[PDB]
Structure formats: C-alpha cells, structure tokens
Subunit: 726 residues, 3 copies
C-alpha cells in the first residue's frame, strides 16, 4: 500500500537570519508569511498563485525573484498514519527536496536532506502514532549554504556559478546562457508513505548478458537483493515472469535460501531491443515476486519493462556505438531543463519526447547542467527506441578534490545508477586528467554498480561564424555531441514573453541594438545593463548569409530562422554524408526550458522554428542529400537501418526548372551510398531533391552558390520549392 | 593547557619504514618541525609554548576570506601583465548587490589601475590587464619589481 | 553476546560483482572465512562462539609493543647474516634513560650474540651483524636453521625485567622473479607442496589437528604450502612448525570473488590486514602475501 502525501500543504517563508532556522519551534516563532502550497511544486508557483509575485516568464520579471534566494521555506501538513502489522515498516518517501532541509515527523527529526537530485527515504515506523500525525519540513537558503565551504582556485571563474560548486543541485538553476537564474526551492517531486513487509525486495537488477536476434534468444541475469527474516529462509520463493502483452515467455520459481541471488534466465522467442531505424524497440514485462511457499501470500512484487540489448563503445570523439553487434550511426539532440521550476518537468515530458519521435532522433544526451530526469522519461525512451547518454550532474567547471565532496557525489552516483541501470535506452554514463571526481569517484561507482554500460570520463561552438568555414567542415571529430546555431523565436512567442513596447527588438529603432528585455532573454543572468553580447550572434549570422539585417521584425524572424535551418541541416547532412568515418552527431538543441532567445529549434511554449522542419527532412531512416564536392556537388543517400531499399531520385533547379539528375538508386543497409556527381550550377539558387521509396514521397533541397544571398530571392526559392512554409 | 609532545608519539603504532631513519621516531606521527628532536646541525630541544603572536580580531559579517593573486601572463618588453584575483568573501544575502569590490594596483602612491565591481556572489574572479608595469626578477636577472595590490569591500550607498 | 552472522549481511547493499559468485553473498560484507558458508570441499556450518583462547594479561608500565625481526642480508658460505630488530615499546618518560634493551641471539643455550643499548626513545632500530650462523632453507636446499631471539627491557639500576619477548627466527632472503619463480638466499628453488584448507568446519578444533597435519607434509616432503583464502588464518603454532620443518608458506588473505570498493569495507580489511601481517611477519617460513 502506497499513500500519497501530495496535495495542499501550508508554506511559511521568511528571510533567513544569520543563524539558520532548523527547528519546528524556530520556524513557528519567526516573522513570516503563510500561504497555501501544492506538492509537488515550487515556492514561486505557490507565491504567484497567492498574488505575491509576478509572472517571471514575461519581461524582466525574472530579476524580481532575486530576494527570495535568501529566504527559508517551511512546509507543513498533517496525515493519517496507516495501520502497521508487527514486522512491517513505514517509510516516508521524498522524490525531491530542494534542497537543504530538516524533516520532522511528530516533533522528531527523521532526516537532514542535502541533495536536490535524488530521493530521500526515512524509516518512520517508531516515531508515528495513532490518529493525526504531523509532517514539517524546514528548508534553508541554498545560496548561503555555499559560504560554508572554502573553494579551490579551480572552482572560481568558470561559467557555472561558484555557489553551485560545493552543493549537489542542478547547475543551470543559478543561471546559464540558455536558462534563467531561478534558484527556487520546495518539494518538487512526489511525497508518499509506503508500507513494507519484513520480506521485501530491496532491488531487482536486470542485466542482458547476450542476445541472438536471428535465433530470437537472449540470456538475462536477475540480480535480486531482498530483506528476509531468517525464519522465512527456505520458506519463501521467487516467481520470475517475463511476458509481452500477457503472452508469457518465462516462468521460473526458485526457493529463497539466501538474501541475494543471481538467477540466469535463458529465453527463447524473444526479440532484441533496437534504437530507431535499426529495428523495433522490443520490450518485455519483467515481474519478480516473493511468495510464501505454504500460504501463497505475496509479500512484494517489482514490475518493469526491460529490453534485451548489448552496448559497446568502440574507440578508434573518435568512437562509435555498437548495439547488438551492429555499428549504429547516432543522430539526436541534447536534452536541457524542461522548466526552470522543475516541479513542472513531469507535465512536459510526454510532449517533449514526442518532439524527438517526430524528429526521428535515435539518441539523446541528458546535459549535466540539468537534473536527472525521472523514471517516466526513460520509460518513454525505452518505448520509442531512443538511446540515452546520461551526464552526471555537473556543468562546466572544476570541483573539489577533498573527501566531503567525494562522499556526497558517491552517494548521489550510487542512487542514480541503481535507479536507472535497468532501462534499455540508457547506453552511456559521462563524467562531463588527475581529477578525483571524474577519474575515481564516478568510475568506482560504475565499476561496482553498473559494469554493463560504458563510462566516459566533440563540442563545436567556437567563433560561431559561417557554418561552412573549416572550423566545422574540417573538424575531424567522428562523433560530435554539441553543435548549434541561433534562431529568433516565432512572433507569437515574442509577443507573449515581451512587454508590448519591447516586442520590436531594436533599441531606439537602431537595427542591431537590442532593447533591455531582449537582453534579459539572452539569457542574462544578473540585471546588469549593457549592449551587445550573446544576442549579437543572431545579427552576425544573418549578416554573413544575407548581407544585411532586415529592419522589419517579420523579415528578421524569417532571415534568422533561415540561417539556423540552413546551418543545422548542413551539419547533419555533412556527418551523414561522410560515413563510415563519421559515427554520430548530437546537435544542440531541440527544446527551450524557458521562454528565451536561444539556439534551440523549438521554444518553451511549443513554437517550432524553421530549423525543426528542415532537420526533420534530413533525419529520415533513408535520406537523399547533396554535399559539396571538388568541382560540383554530390548526390548521396544515407541509410541508418539494417535493410536495403531501392528508389528513384530527381534533382531540379527551382528557379529555371531544369532537370539536373534523374535515376534509380539502391541504398545498402547502414552505410552511405554515392548516387551521382552533380555538375556545377551557375550563380546562386536552390536545387530540389525528390525521391520515392516503397511508394512514399520524400523531399530535400540544396542551396548552391556562395553568400551573401538576397533575402527575398531565397524566400522565392523556398516558396517555389514547395516543401516548407514561410 | 599543553601536553608532552614526546609522550604523544606512543599513542601511535609505527610502520617499519618510520623506524630507524635519521628523523626521530617521536617525530613521525606528529606535525612538528623534525629538527626539534635533534639533528646533526641542531640540538635536541623539544620545547613548548605559544611561539608566535596571539591576537583578537574583530570582523564584520561582510569580510574578505581570501584574496588570491595570480599572474596569468607577463610581457616585460611591453611593460604589461595579466593578473587574476580569486576573491572569496563572507556576504550575508541582504548584502548581495549592495556591496562592491574596490581593487587597486599602485606603486608608491601612484595609482596604476582601479577596478570596481558589484558583489553579486560570494566568490569571484577578476582579471586585470595592466599597462606600464615591470616584471619581477630574481637577483642578477633584473629588478624585483613589486606593486601594492589592495582589495576592499565597500558599501555602495554609505561607503562603509 | 553474539548475534547472527547471516542476518548481519542484510545490513549492507551489495554491488553486482558480489552477487552470484561461488562464495556466499552472506560472505561478501563480513570478515569471516568464506568456507564456513559452504564450498565444494567444505560443508555449510556457520557456527559461532569463542573459538580460541581467552586470557587475562598483566603488563608493566614498561612493556614491549612489538619486536619485528627482519633479515637484511645473509651469506650462507661465510656463515654470516645481518638481522634488524624494529622495536616499539611503551615507555613512561620517567623510565627514559633508565631502561635498557637486552638482545640475545642464542641456539641450544649457546650464545651467538648479546647486545645492550640504553632506551632513550620508545622506538628503535637495532642492527645485528652475526657471525657463526647458518641460513634457513626450505626442505631439500638446506637445513631449516633456527635461532632463538630474545629481547628484554631491564631497569639499569635494579635489574628488574619489565618485559621479555622470545621467538625462533630464521636468517633468509626471499624474492619473487616475475609465471614466476621463488628465490631463497639467492638460489632459484622448485616448489612442490599442498594447498592448506580448513582443518575442521568447527575451527576451534583446528589447533588439535595442526601437529599431525603438518607431519603429513613432512612425510610428503613438501617444501611449500599455500594457505587457501577460504580458510581462517592459522595461529602461531602452525607457522612455528613450518619454520622447524622448512616448509615455505604462501599466505592468502581471507578473500573468497569480488568485494566492495567502498570505504567501510576498506577500513575493516585494512584493520585485519595490519593485525595479521604484524602477527606473522617474523616467521621465516612465510614467503609471500597474496590478494587471492
């Protein structure tokens, strides 16, 4: 039985005195403000509902939340203690405390929380009582907690805040160039009460030893750890069932003689899990139960969906992923925070994963600047066949080499690894040379708790000039994990997040100068007035491609989104076209975590920029594309599947209508195939790529010539090409 | 109330490598100058006491915990250098955005450079690109040029 | 008051590499012999109790904490050897400069060397250059030569003996040439012997089997024995007999087979490793430690 403590709570907040409040008495004696609160939630959401703060998504309202970083937060509610039978255990489960808090049950402290990113379970069996009980949580200022530490030289001056270095919180919450500064606080995930039996399952760890797709066989290991009273030894059995849609695959029963056991399961009639393109994402319900031999009473049951696959990181960013023995070409996006108030992440996960399914990503890199996503995110990636590269939660900086930080990081790593090691989508852990953190603490955790996945102790930003400069086109990285280009968001998003007088970007009507609110949406971390900076990437990249920056807002949106769309499509066509040497491209990024101006290709409110649709047409399983060649161009077809296909391709000049090429092609599986050389066209213009495979039509294009182009002429070529809207 | 340093050694079990060296076995488990137990160039005089100053210091809630000056680069021909300041402070949150750091490089009262910046967080890196500054050299290889580096935490309103 | 060893294992969360090995998962986080939980050559009999001697000891303020004998060099032809004594004591400061260390190397009552030194610090290294002494060899390559080594702390005024430590040591050097080869006294030796397993599932009866079980190795003409990591550490008498009968000892630590990489297990193992090493590092029969 699980009993949700989510719902309406009482939240009292006040400035933190020099001595932090930590007791129930001190919290009730402090001068503060009391409002109703929702759990899971963030304190700013409750405050906005109480009319105490203004919408931080709009204008410069993010800076008005600054004073609350030095506040404390006192959650309170009462609950009904469940009935407990002799030997049973009552556990208070916290999915997320943000962050430094003292937890009390009936005036008795039961725990001191100190990590935003992991669960916190407290055995409260002996401190509860009949009738109404009392739960009180007293949070301290996360920012002020940093001054309890002395920083090393390496932890000062990085892009990540010095306040983040000694604490275990998501680094992006202190502000980033793609995330607002919104430290926040609160119980941002579920709070539940759980009753456990003296016979219970501690952990069920499913490991794929081998898979044989052609014979439809696989060897799965179950590493089972349990709590078992000794007079229950030789009197309880495990019931292991693997099923798919109800149809059973395996039933194995074993007498429980010791508390931990390795059960090897050799299965037949099982399909292998594959990433998108390379096969189906076959999943199987794995269920383990502890059952009394005599009465048949079930003491515990653990159920999940597992997948049978093998992963090997084959080094030569000079590496390629080997899935089930086949070398896969990765194409996907980096995953950034879904919301600055992370209690709303769960409400965004399903639609955000749908962005990747429609994009046809086969991989996603969960950026270490974000929290660790919850189980549902990985369940969706298992279901839709999206490989997951998981960073440990550390942004862009250096960290302490001392013991106290290593102990906190070790505890976090053990928690998250044991939590996620059973998802087939997860394929890699990353630490993000003498560093103790990335070469000892994390590697020792992967060594003991997940020897099945590779651990990694590439990033193409740089000058961010013309996307055809040799910085990009001659970078020798086989596998890139970060690469992006700026694009102004859609007008409807601009009008929603800016004040009416600030929708038009030009300060004093001077093209190229940004008003103060656009500067805030850079993002700008602190309210410090200046001109230029990150926003100038938009105008600089527009000026390179189109000669001049349009003054009209609609013309500027189209020009900016066209440069982002052309650049990102070019990077993906450049890596797909140079296989087998190129092994993967993880681009940045697919979705904003806050209404901002960014290099993402779709904004926080779901507004897709032109890059999303361009990218979608170069992300197909089998994609015809054109790459520049010595003299002229080259028509290629790239196949990211294990199947051969045949089709017909036609290339025409959009302006004149002249046919450039027409013929048939065979696309051999999992490789790039060169179709035909294309002769050099004169001047500037656009080629349209039409091809048909299995009675389905597909469309691509190639922009030839050299910049600068004329914006209205490029807009004419897009409309006459007939593929994308304007 | 000070105890016997010599008798403290017997609270530890020594490893083989810590026995038989010219350093005394009494010195192996303690953090004291090894020569105090005796050397070929120093007498044995274990001694004890408060051998350096004892003071009382009054600090404000806003205070400089550490000022770490680092030379990134130096160009003696151009009389230039790039000096970083790694500054750590104690800063009550109410003092955030209300205090500024005032950084001064000077030589015999003549101000070489002044930089001011608002304290928005407790720890910061400030990089100073200096002109008209000579490098520091050991004897024979040049002059031992020194410069007064000062940092203060000043209230932006009251000037405190 | 002893509690259940099996139930203690459920106070630890195990890593994957500690689940599914031949040794029991109950054995992974606890410092016991893995064979007590069962093996292919040993029954499952966990047992409990005070399985070795319980004694009450009275020590003087001046006492010997450890006498560590180390063979620096040996010359079997010239019948010479250099032996080092790493001596650690408890010494009240009033007894500084008032106690002396008396060291006697003898054999069958015949004194080989006697050395006296005033105790001016609690820990000292004494180097002894002995003449007229033979080297210790394993069976076949020579005689298992042993000499009685005695160290006493004596009041320099009254002659009162505050403590005395006595053992039989052997002068020998051991080197491993690295798929390796043992080098005793500069000579490569061929190893031939047995693996020592538990002498009894109820280990309190081990001490009564030692004499007859070592005789078996003597009649076999073993020159080496490897104590298996699944067993307990043998007591002093086993190594004394291996000294007397010239049987080299390969000592496994009590591992079974992968264990925790975390701090708690590492502190418990270092505590055990230091205790066992200090206890056995003076026996000439011991030639090699192994992680097993």
């Amino acid at each position: 039985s699980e009993q949700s403590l989510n719902g309406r709570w009482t939240l009292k907040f006040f400035p933190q005195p020099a001595v932090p409040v930590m007791t129930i008495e001190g919290a009730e004696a402090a001068n503060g403000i009391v409002v109703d609160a929702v759990v899971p939630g963030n304190v700013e959401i409750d405050m906005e509902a109480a009319g105490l703060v203004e919408d931080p998504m709009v204008g410069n309202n993010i800076y008005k939340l600054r004073p609350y970083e030095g506040y404390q937060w006192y959650y309170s509610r009462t609950f009904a203690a469940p009935v407990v039978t002799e030997g049973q255990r009552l556990v208070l489960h916290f999915g997320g405390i943000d962050t430094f808090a003292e937890v009390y049950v009936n005036g008795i402290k039961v725990g001191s929380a100190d990590n935003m990113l992991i669960e916190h379970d407290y055995d409260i069996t002996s401190v509860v009582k009949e009738g109404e009980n009392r739960l009180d949580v007293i949070i301290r200022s996360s920012v002020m907690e940093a001054q309890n530490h002395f920083l090393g030289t390496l932890s000062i001056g990085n892009f990540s805040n010095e306040e983040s270095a000694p604490v275990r919180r998501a680094p992006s919450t202190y502000g980033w160039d793609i995330m607002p500064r919104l430290v926040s606080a609160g119980l941002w995930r579920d709070v539940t009460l759980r009753v456990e039996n003296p016979v219970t399952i501690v952990d069920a760890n499913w490991v794929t030893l081998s898979v044989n797709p052609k014979a439809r066989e696989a060897s799965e290991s179950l590493y089972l750890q349990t709590r078992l009273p000794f007079e229950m030894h030789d009197k309880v059995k495990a019931v292991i069932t693997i099923s798919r849609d109800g149809r059973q695959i395996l039933r194995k029963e074993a007498l429980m003689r010791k508390f931990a056991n390795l059960f090897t399961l050799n299965l037949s009639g099982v399909d292998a899990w594959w990433p998108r393109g390379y096969g189906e994402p076959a999943l199987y319900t794995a269920e383990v139960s502890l059952v009394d031999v005599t009465s048949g009473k079930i003491y515990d049951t653990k159920t999940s969906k597992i997948g049978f696959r093998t992963v090997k990181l084959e080094l030569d960013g000079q590496f390629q992923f080997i899935i089930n023995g086949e070398p896969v070409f990765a194409k996907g996006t980096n995953w950034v925070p879904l919301d600055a108030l992370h209690s709303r992440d769960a409400s965004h996960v399903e639609e955000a994963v749908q962005l990747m399914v429609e994009m046809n990503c086969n991989i996603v890199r969960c950026w270490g600047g974000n929290v660790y996503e919850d189980t549902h995110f990985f369940e969706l990636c298992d279901k839709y066949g999206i490989m997951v590269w998981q960073d440990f939660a550390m942004g862009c900086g250096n960290y302490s080499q001392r013991d106290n930080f290593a102990a906190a990081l070790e505890k976090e790593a053990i928690s998250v690894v044991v939590k996620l090691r059973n998802h087939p989508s997860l394929i890699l852990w990353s630490g993000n040379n003498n560093d103790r953190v990335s070469r000892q603490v994390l590697s020792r955790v992967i060594y003991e708790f997940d020897p099945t996945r590779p651990y990694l102790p590439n990033h193409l930003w740089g000058p961010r000039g013309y996307y055809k400069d040799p910085f990009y086109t001659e970078n020798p990285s086989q596998f890139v994990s970060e690469i992006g280009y700026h694009g102004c968001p859609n007008r409807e998003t601009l009008e929603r997040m800016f004040s009416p007088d600030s929708v038009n970007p030009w300060q004093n009507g001077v093209v190229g100068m940004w008003n103060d609110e656009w500067q805030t949406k850079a993002n700008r971390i602190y309210d410090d007035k200046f001109q230029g900076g990150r926003n100038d990437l938009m105008t600089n990249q527009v000026r390179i491609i189109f000669g001049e920056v349009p003054a009209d807002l609609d013309d500027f949106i189209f020009a900016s989104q066209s440069v982002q769309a052309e650049a990102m499509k070019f990077f993906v066509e450049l890596w797909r076209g140079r296989r087998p040497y190129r092994t993967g491209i993880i681009w940045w990024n697919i979705r904003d975590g806050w209404p901002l101006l960014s290099d993402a290709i779709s904004d926080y409110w779901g507004g897709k920029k032109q890059a999303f649709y361009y990218m979608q047409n170069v992300h197909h399983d089998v994609c015809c594309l054109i790459n520049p060649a010595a003299n002229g161009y080259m028509l290629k077809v790239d196949n990211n599947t294990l199947k051969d296909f045949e089709g017909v391709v036609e290339v025409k000049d959009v302006a004149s209508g002249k046919q450039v090429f027409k013929g048939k092609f065979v696309s051999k599986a999992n490789q790039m195939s060169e179709i035909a050389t294309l002769p050099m066209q004169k001047g500037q213009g656009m080629l349209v790529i039409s091809y048909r495979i299995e009675g389905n039509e597909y469309f691509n294009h190639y922009l030839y010539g050299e910049p600068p182009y004329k914006l209205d002429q490029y807009r004419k070529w897009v409309k006459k090409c007939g593929i994308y809207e304007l």
